[PDB]
Enzyme design. Structure first.
Site, PDB file in Angstrom:
ATOM      1  CG  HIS A   1      -1.842  -1.349   1.395  1.00 32.73           C
ATOM      2  ND1 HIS A   1      -1.274  -2.340   2.367  1.00 32.73           N
ATOM      3  CD2 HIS A   1      -3.005  -1.546   0.881  1.00 32.73           C
ATOM      4  CE1 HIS A   1      -2.049  -3.211   2.071  1.00 32.73           C
ATOM      5  NE2 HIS A   1      -3.116  -2.763   1.373  1.00 32.73           N
TER       6      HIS A   1
HETATM    7  S1  FES Z   1       1.821  -0.402   2.890  1.00 31.65           S
HETATM    8 FE1  FES Z   1       0.263  -1.806   3.592  1.00 31.65          FE
HETATM    9  S2  FES Z   1       1.355  -3.717   4.269  1.00 31.65           S
HETATM   10 FE2  FES Z   1       2.970  -2.015   3.802  1.00 31.65          FE
END
Ligand code: FES
Ligand SMILES: CCCCCCCC/C=C\CCCCCCCC(=O)OC[C@H](COP(=O)(O)OCCN)OC(=O)CCCCCCC/C=C\CCCCCCCC
Ligand SMILES: CCCCCCCC/C=C\CCCCCCCC(=O)OC[C@H](COP(=O)(O)OCCN)OC(=O)CCCCCCC/C=C\CCCCCCCC
Ligand code: HEM
Ligand code: HEM
Ligand code: HEM
Ligand code: HEM
Ligand SMILES: COc1nn(C)c(=O)n1-c1cccc2ccc(C#CC(C)(C)C)cc12
Ligand SMILES: CCCCCCCCO[C@@H]1O[C@H](CO)[C@@H](O)[C@H](O)[C@H]1O
Ligand SMILES: CCCCCCCCO[C@@H]1O[C@H](CO)[C@@H](O)[C@H](O)[C@H]1O
Ligand SMILES: CCCCCCCCO[C@@H]1O[C@H](CO)[C@@H](O)[C@H](O)[C@H]1O
Ligand SMILES: CCCCCCCCO[C@@H]1O[C@H](CO)[C@@H](O)[C@H](O)[C@H]1O
Lengths: 48, 147, 109, 101, 380, 80, 61, 108, 55
Positions: B112
């Protein structure tokens, strides 16, 4: 995902019918026995 | 007699020899050159041990201690500047980062976003904290024992 | 419990021995009802009024002697088995309970 | 003014035990004091409470209540046990206090 | 010895004095049907559970698939599996109505029956918690992780009691194996403790909805209640089967159809409905330790009810103020349940602490207070 | 032995009829339903209220949550 | 009057009552199953393998 | 009742079978196997559970799980020994219990 | 049916473990019954004569 899919549903049909039949029957029976208490009448007759 | 039998039985439930056998890992700093991040396997999860050049340790000081979600300067994380040891797991939803890349040259979680600097701190992204820093220490100018 | 039990025995397992004796008792009984002028008069007044005639001990005895186990069982079953009885209870009757339980004592020996 | 009275009479109807033909004192939870108090009730008040209660239980199983006519009225509720119960507690408190001294 | 062998025999006599000639109030309602259901429910779990345990393998590398093999290859394994999993919910639904009924009718004034009851609830909770971990799906693992990590919040003896329970450093194979053992064992403790529950109960006999002595009108358990309960059994059994046969996964997380993975945290780690409310209270107090205590207290609070009774009457039948307060509380719980299923964000966060706050207030302060006030309005 | 020691009762008479002489579910309309209504009525205003209040709270909080996920144009009015 | 007949022949003697339940069950099963299966298949025409089977059942290759 | 050992619904049970329970003044050692059998049972269950928390019921892992228990589990080897041998103690005891009963017509 | 197949194999092992876990409890349960009947009469003694005179 769930091969049983069809047998499961066919079973649900059988379960409902029997469930409908048995529940009615048992309701009657419960009522039949209790009828004795449900209609029961009492009175208090002291030697007054 | 009772104290002993209970002691023995109770203890039969704590970690067994085979499990304790992987309790801690010792890494040789000599195998890890500067400017190159080396990751090992510790407790089933990736263990990050990067050799920080005198150059990277600098980009580090240049960090606003009070401009980060998990406010901590290198000082509070490491011990030996040329040495940074993190638990390779994004603090967001358990993913494993990618070193050298990212907007802050540190690590990048391709799940993410969550960008971590060279000191392993959450910069740009959803992750709440900075990569975790586990217990450890050093032994001789070439060995480290994490765990 | 025991009483109703005996009724169930009557319908299901009477013994010739039992009827045989029961008959002798019953005979001596009918005879003992004609022991005096009043008790013989009571019989006459009643018989006429009820049977529309007199029934001699000689008759009673003929009928009583025809009764046997197999017979007693059939009659009792016909009048007692699985019937809903009438119950009257007076006094400290807390321990006697439920018409339902009593009704169920009307079947299966 | 007659506030306290308005309120009480209100709650009395709100509760609704009277719909079962029960007196307030009939609904008391039978703890130790109440149990002793009941032992002092005169034979007649005892059998009356007994019938009232057995009557209510029969109504309960039947899922019925008494016709509005038969409902105990606020002002006609006889506090038949309160007198006894109060003394029983007074006697107890005497003892309790005396065994401390 | 005695005329009928139902009273003399050392065993039948026991069956008789608790299921046939046993004195029961003539007016107990449907709310008194949950006891037998709970019992029946328990036998069913054990029965289906054993049938499932004969095909399960307690090993991280085989758990998930053993369960799948059971559903896919074992004759009716899929049915047995459904029944057991859904049976758990029926069990809790029943236990919550059982508990409710007792609170609303002051059954708890039967202290030992009440207390054994709280122990039954606690044991049951643990039982399901360990059972849930067995299939070893994503939620199985993470629930196990999230909740057992809490103990590390206890002072000094924390990080240890935890690493002792896991049998290592994280929920791993050594944890799975001991959980299976525990899951197999607790139901029996439950059955045992249930015998104690009913034993204390029989000292007093059942309470009834009007909360006044029912000695003046008692009826034999059989046939009155034997029939009433069987009817109650079929009436509940219908929704159960309808759910377990038509909408098998309604109440369950899909995340549990994915083999556990220590390197992937699910987005929303929420419990099964029956634990939601507690999970809500947990998160209501930000502070690992406070939240724990709050959680403990949430269920342990039940041990104090008997001592917080101020009314002069037993039940809430003739106590209208208590009645709304009672339904307010019920509603309070639905909300906590709802909050337990949502993320930790506004507005849910604040609503959470409110419901949590009101929860303890209603039981610790209001109930006893309104009760006293009510006593005065009867001129007592 | 629990039947016979229960209570001291005097002067109460009771009449009952065998289950076979009476109807199991009698007077459904003349007695049954009326009471079912009676009971429902008497209780509705005690139970219903807090559930209704619970609903609203749910409804509000749910909708309010979604509204906070939407964008407020007043953050892009001068973003040219 | 069947009710009387039934009562006399079937429901009076507890031994015959059991016999009625047993023989009654056997018949009930046979019938109930056939009916249910029938209702299920009708409600599902052309969907079950029973229905489409003929296409590959010895009619191909 | 005066003492809580007789009134309490539970202690009363413990009392009427292990404290105030009437026993012949002359029972010998052959009457000791009942309790042993009982104790023996509690021991098996206890050691058995401890072992079950480390066993794996799978042909491919059974043998080795037991071995892993003896070699790696703290006192697993002891617990394993006790459980396995406890089985025999159990039977030894049960045979003497049975004998005793046959020789003194307890079976009546 | 007992093997869960055609020979003693994995399906047998798993059901045996379950059975081995279960039976001890049945034993403990049944033992309670054993002692219950026993207490009806009380213990017998080596001389086989009523010991009510000395308990
Ligand atoms: S940015 Fe969501 S698990 Fe690493
Ligand atoms: C706990 C975890 C939370 C999980 C969710 C809880 C489940 C929520 C489902 C709602 C319950 C449905 C019940 C609807 C029945 C409505 C009804 O009949 O109310 C009126 C009726 C009137 O009774 P009387 O005044 O005696 O009448 C005498 C004259 N006729 O009241 C009752 O039936 C008595 C109340 C008993 C049922 C309460 C069940 C609620 C369940 C929740 C558990 C709460 C307790 C705390 C648990 C802590 C853990
Ligand atoms: C193809 C299948 C063929 C094989 C099936 C064999 C079954 C044969 C059973 C024998 C027949 C029963 C004989 C009983 C006789 C005793 C008796 O009195 O009847 C029972 C007696 C009735 O009393 P009376 O109406 O007064 O009768 C007086 C007669 N003069 O008691 C009853 O109420 C029993 C009937 C109610 C059934 C209750 C069942 C409720 C349960 C439902 C849940 C579903 C089932 C799941 C089972 C779980 C298994 C793990
Ligand atoms: C496996 C769990 C449980 C089982 C099998 C169980 C079973 C029973 C049974 C059979 C009854 C009698 C019938 C009835 O009144 O419903 C009963 C009564 C009771 N139980 Fe439980 N129970 C369980 C849990 C609990 C819990 C959690 C509590 C409460 C904390 C509790 C409190 C009570 C009380 C106080 C009674 C008396 C009811 C009355 O007022 O008459 N029980 N239980
Ligand atoms: C109080 C009784 C019990 C409760 C509440 C209970 C509850 C549960 C729960 C919540 C699960 C998870 C089911 C799923 O969603 O996959 C489960 C799994 C399991 N339970 Fe139980 N259980 C009980 C008793 C038993 C017993 C007595 C056994 C056998 C000794 C047993 C054996 C199992 C097995 C083998 C699993 C794993 C298979 C599966 O995942 O379905 N359970 N149980
Ligand atoms: C787990 C198995 C068993 C346990 C735990 C058990 C337990 C006991 C206990 C505690 C006693 C009382 C003390 C004594 O007399 O030794 C007892 C008595 C007795 N048991 Fe067992 N027993 C077991 C198996 C058996 C077996 C297999 C038999 C014989 C077939 C048996 C026959 C008896 C008899 C007849 C007595 C009466 C002793 C007397 O003559 O006074 N028991 N048992
Ligand atoms: C009547 C009580 C018990 C008896 C007679 C008994 C007997 C035995 C026997 C004969 C073995 C073989 C040991 C060997 O030589 O390797 C064994 C294995 C086993 N028992 Fe039990 N057992 C009892 C109770 C239990 C219980 C209650 C559990 C736990 C719920 C259990 C768990 C185990 C386990 C895990 C094994 C495999 C480990 C091993 O092989 O040592 N047992 N038991
Ligand atoms: C194996 O973990 C779980 N088992 N079950 C049945 C369940 O719902 N979970 C869970 C799965 C996912 C998240 C969970 C969060 C909190 C809890 C809890 C609890 C207590 C015991 C304190 C009531 C269980 C969770
Ligand atoms: C897989 O087949 C199933 O076999 C069952 C019979 O065992 C049928 O009742 C189901 O309808 C059918 O889908
Ligand atoms: C309330 C009790 C309800 C019990 C319902 C029993 C019905 C189960 O019936 C099942 O139907 C399946 C589909 O044809 C068959 O394959 C199974 O062999 C059969 O047992
Ligand atoms: C000889 O080694 C022993 O091994 C044991 C392992 O179980 C330890 O607990 C003892 O302390 C150790 O002395
Ligand atoms: O025998 C004993 O008989 C007692 C009386 O029933 C029980 O309470 C005990 O549990 C039982 O062991």
């Amino acid at each position: 995902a769930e091969p049983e899919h069809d047998q499961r549903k066919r079973m649900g049909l059988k379960m409902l019918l029997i469930s409908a039949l048995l529940t009615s029957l048992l309701y009657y029976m419960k009522r039949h026995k209790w009828s004795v208490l449900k209609s029961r009448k009492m009175a208090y007759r002291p030697p007054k | 007699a009772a104290k002993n039998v209970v002691t023995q039985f109770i203890s039969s439930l704590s970690a067994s020899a085979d499990v304790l056998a992987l309790s801690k890992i010792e890494i040789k700093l000599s195998d890890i050159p500067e400017g190159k991040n080396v990751a090992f396997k510790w407790r089933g999860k990736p263990l990050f041990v990067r050799h920080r050049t005198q150059a990277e340790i600098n980009q580090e000081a240049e960090v606003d201690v009070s401009k980060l979600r998990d406010p901590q300067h290198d000082l509070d994380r490491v011990k030996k500047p040329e040495w940074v040891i993190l638990v390779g797991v994004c603090t967001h939803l358990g993913c494993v980062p990618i070193a050298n890349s990212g907007d802050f040259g540190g690590y990048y979680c391709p799940c993410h976003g969550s960008h971590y600097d060279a000191s392993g701190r959450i910069r740009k992204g959803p992750a709440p904290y900075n990569l975790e820093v586990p217990t450890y220490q050093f032994v001789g100018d070439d060995l480290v024992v994490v765990g | 419990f025991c009483a109703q039990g005996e009724w169930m025995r009557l319908c299901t397992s009477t013994t010739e021995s039992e009827v045989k004796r029961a008959k002798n008792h019953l005979r001596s009984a009918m005879v003992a009802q004609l022991d005096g002028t009043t008790p013989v008069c009571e019989t006459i007044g009643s018989h006429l009024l009820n049977y529309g005639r007199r029934i001699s001990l000689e008759e009673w005895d003929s009928r009583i002697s025809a009764v046997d186990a197999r017979m007693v069982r059939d009659v009792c079953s016909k009048y007692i088995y699985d019937k809903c009885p009438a119950l009257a209870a007076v006094g400290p009757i807390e321990q006697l309970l439920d018409y339902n339980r009593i009704r169920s004592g009307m079947y299966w020996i | 003014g007659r506030l306290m009275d308005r309120i009480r009479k209100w709650y009395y109807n709100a509760a609704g035990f009277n719909k079962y033909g029960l007196m307030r004192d009939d609904t008391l939870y039978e703890d130790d004091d109440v149990k002793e108090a009941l032992k002092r009730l005169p034979e007649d008040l005892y059998n009356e409470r007994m019938f009232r209660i057995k009557r209510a239980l029969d109504l309960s199983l039947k899922h019925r209540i008494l016709p509005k006519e038969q409902w105990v009225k606020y002002e006609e509720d006889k506090p038949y046990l309160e007198p006894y119960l109060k003394e029983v507690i007074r006697e107890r408190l005497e003892r309790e206090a005396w065994n401390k001294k | 010895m005695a005329p009928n062998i139902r009273k003399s025999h050392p065993l039948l006599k026991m069956i008789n004095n608790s299921l046939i000639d046993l004195p029961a109030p003539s007016n107990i309602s449907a709310w008194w049907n949950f006891g037998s259901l709970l019992a029946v429910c328990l036998m069913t779990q054990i029965l289906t559970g054993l049938l499932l345990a004969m095909h399960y393998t307690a090993d991280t590398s085989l758990a998930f698939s053993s369960v799948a093999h059971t559903c896919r290859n074992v004759q009716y394994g899929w049915l047995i599996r459904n029944l057991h999993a859904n049976g758990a919910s029926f069990f809790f639904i029943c236990i919550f109505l059982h508990i409710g009924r007792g609170l609303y009718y002051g059954s708890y004034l039967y202290k030992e029956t009440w207390n054994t009851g709280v122990i039954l609830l606690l044991t049951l909770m643990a039982t399901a918690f360990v059972g849930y971990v067995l299939p070893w799906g994503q939620m199985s693992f993470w629930g196990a992780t999230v909740i057992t990590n809490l103990f590390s919040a206890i002072p000094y003896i924390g990080h240890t009691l935890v690493e002792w329970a896991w049998g290592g450093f994280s929920v791993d194979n050594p944890t799975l194996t001991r959980f299976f053992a525990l899951h197999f064992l607790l139901p029996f403790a439950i059955a045992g403790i249930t015998i104690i529950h009913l034993t204390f109960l029989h000292e007093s006999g059942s309470n009834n909805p009007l909360g006044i002595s029912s000695d003046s009108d008692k009826i034999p358990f059989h046939p009155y209640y034997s029939f009433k309960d069987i009817l109650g059994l079929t009436l509940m059994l219908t929704p159960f089967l309808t759910l377990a046969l038509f909408s098998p996964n309604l109440l369950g997380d899909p995340e549990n159809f994915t083999p556990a993975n220590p390197l992937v945290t699910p987005p929303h780690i929420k419990p099964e409905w029956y634990f939601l409310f507690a999970y809500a209270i947990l998160r209501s107090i930000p502070n690992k330790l406070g939240g724990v205590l709050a959680l403990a207290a949430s269920v342990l609070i039940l041990f104090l009810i008997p001592f917080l009774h101020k009314s002069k009457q037993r039940t809430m039948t003739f106590r209208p103020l208590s009645q709304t307060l009672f339904w307010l509380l019920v509603a309070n719980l639905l909300i906590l349940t709802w909050i337990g299923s949502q993320p930790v964000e506004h507005p849910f966060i604040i609503i959470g602490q409110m419901a949590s706050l009101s929860y303890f207030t209603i039981l610790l302060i209001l109930f006893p207070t309104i009760g006293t006030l009510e006593n005065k309005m009867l001129n007592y | 032995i629990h039947f016979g020691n229960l209570a001291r009762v005097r002067h109460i008479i009771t009449y009952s009829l065998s289950p076979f002489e009476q109807r199991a579910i009698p007077n459904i309309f003349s007695d049954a339903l009326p009471n079912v209504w009676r009971r429902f009525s008497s209780q509705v205003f005690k139970v219903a209220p807090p559930f209704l209040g619970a609903y609203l709270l749910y409804s509000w909080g749910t909708q309010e949550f979604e509204r906070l996920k939407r964008k407020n144009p007043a953050d892009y009015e001068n973003d040219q | 009057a069947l009710l009387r007949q039934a009562y006399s022949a079937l429901f009076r003697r507890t031994s015959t009552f059991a016999l009625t339940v047993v023989l009654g069950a056997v018949l009930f099963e046979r019938a109930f199953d056939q009916g249910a299966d029938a209702i299920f298949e009708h409600l599902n025409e052309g969907k079950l393998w029973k229905h489409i089977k003929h296409k590959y059942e010895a009619s191909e290759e």
